[PDB]
Design a protein around this ligand. Structure first.
Ligand SMILES: CCO[C@@H](Cc1ccc(OCCc2ccc(OS(C)(=O)=O)cc2)cc1)C(=O)O
Length: 258
């Protein structure tokens, strides 16, 4: 029944709105700065950055740190959201932990696109905008870890998905089952199967003209994996070049064996 599938889509959208403070809707509205309710401060260089901490509540390491803090925060919102997916909290605890361990970063890069445009990314809850060119000019290793995200953001944003779409797609990512170390696959697959039906319908109804958008969206998932991997090894390099520093424990525990 299409009706049960719509009920599920609305449930997921609602929970998404409540779990994530900054939606794509608000983000795109800020990025298209014609809506002057509140425009962002733009950081494009050193002085921009220092003037940044001014109104916005070495450089490279500070940014690196910032991403980690935002990351840790996002893991907590995604975790809150995951709990709202029917059946998720009823799975064996070990698997709930596993699906989160592998889902979190694919979702973080997915939602990150929502705050990006070809030239930059919204930081500090939309109050700031950091350009792509500034991030790419960062010192030796810290100067290229963001580019892959932007390239993905550009292609991914072309699908023109909105928050209601994303909310179900996000749920499909978490209830994979192909994740390494799962004890009970079937209960996870039955759920994802149902989530897939809801996402298919949702795209069909919300994007009548977008031919095979469902297929195109699913393909984007192979892109996320490569982004995660690529980022993990760039992280390994940093941990070695900077011994006086360390990756936040949560991120560290998420990366232990992947
Ligand atoms: C290096 C840490 O990377 C995170 C993933 C990540 C990457 C980028 C990201 O957001 C990019 C936009 C951004 C840029 C600077 C920033 O810091 S600041 C101090 O300027 O607010 C915060 C977010 C969020 C999570 C991980 O491995 O878990």
């Amino acid at each position: 029944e299409s009706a049960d599938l719509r009920a599920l889509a609305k449930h997921l959208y609602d929970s998404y709105i409540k779990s994530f403070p900054l939606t794509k809707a608000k983000a795109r509205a800020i990025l298209t700065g014609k809506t002057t309710d509140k425009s962002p401060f733009v950081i494009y260089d050193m002085n921009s950055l220092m003037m940044g901490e001014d109104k916005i509540k070495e450089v490279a390491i500070r940014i690196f740190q910032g991403c980690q803090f935002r990351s840790v925060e996002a893991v907590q919102e995604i975790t809150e959201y995951a709990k709202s997916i029917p059946g998720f909290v009823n799975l064996d605890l070990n698997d709930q932990v596993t699906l989160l361990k592998y889902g979190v970063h694919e979702i973080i890069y997915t939602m990150l696109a929502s705050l990006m445009n070809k030239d930059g990314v919204l930081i500090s809850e939309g109050q700031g905008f950091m350009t792509r060119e500034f991030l790419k000019s960062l010192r030796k290793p810290f100067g290229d870890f963001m580019e892959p995200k932007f390239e993905f953001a550009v292609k991914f944003n072309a699908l023109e998905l909105d928050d209601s779409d994303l909310a179900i797609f996000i749920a499909v990512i978490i209830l994979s089952g192909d994740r390494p170390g799962l004890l009970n696959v079937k209960p996870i697959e039955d759920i994802q199967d149902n989530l897939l039906q809801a996402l298919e319908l949702q795209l069909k109804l919300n994007h009548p003209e977008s031919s095979q958008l469902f297929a195109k969206l699913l393909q984007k998932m192979t892109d996320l994996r490569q982004i995660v991997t690529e980022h993990v090894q760039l992280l390994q390099v940093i941990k070695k070049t900077e011994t006086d520093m360390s990756l936040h424990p949560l991120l560290q525990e998420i990366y232990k064996d992947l």
